[PDB]
Amino acid sequence: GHMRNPAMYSEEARLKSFQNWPDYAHLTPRELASAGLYYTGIGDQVQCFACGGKLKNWEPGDRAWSEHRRHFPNCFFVL
């Protein structure tokens, strides 16, 4: 399948999307961007540049790579 958002292929562009990322979310922009996730600007809601998979309600103890892979098995980025 196709890369859903090529504008967010750069890990640096994913990091820059984390403006006003909330304190309660616990996971950092650095970890989320490294797992292919960028910020949508809403709550703690992130999206994968590769599969377009959407993730929210991050809890302390979550790992960005694990949640991404477990919920989106079709994703080429975390496969």
Binding site: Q45, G53, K54, L55, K56, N57, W58, E59, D62, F72
Partner: peptide
């Protein structure tokens, strides 16, 4: 985390 659509 939970997925959403």
């Amino acid at each position: 985390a939970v997925x959403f659509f």
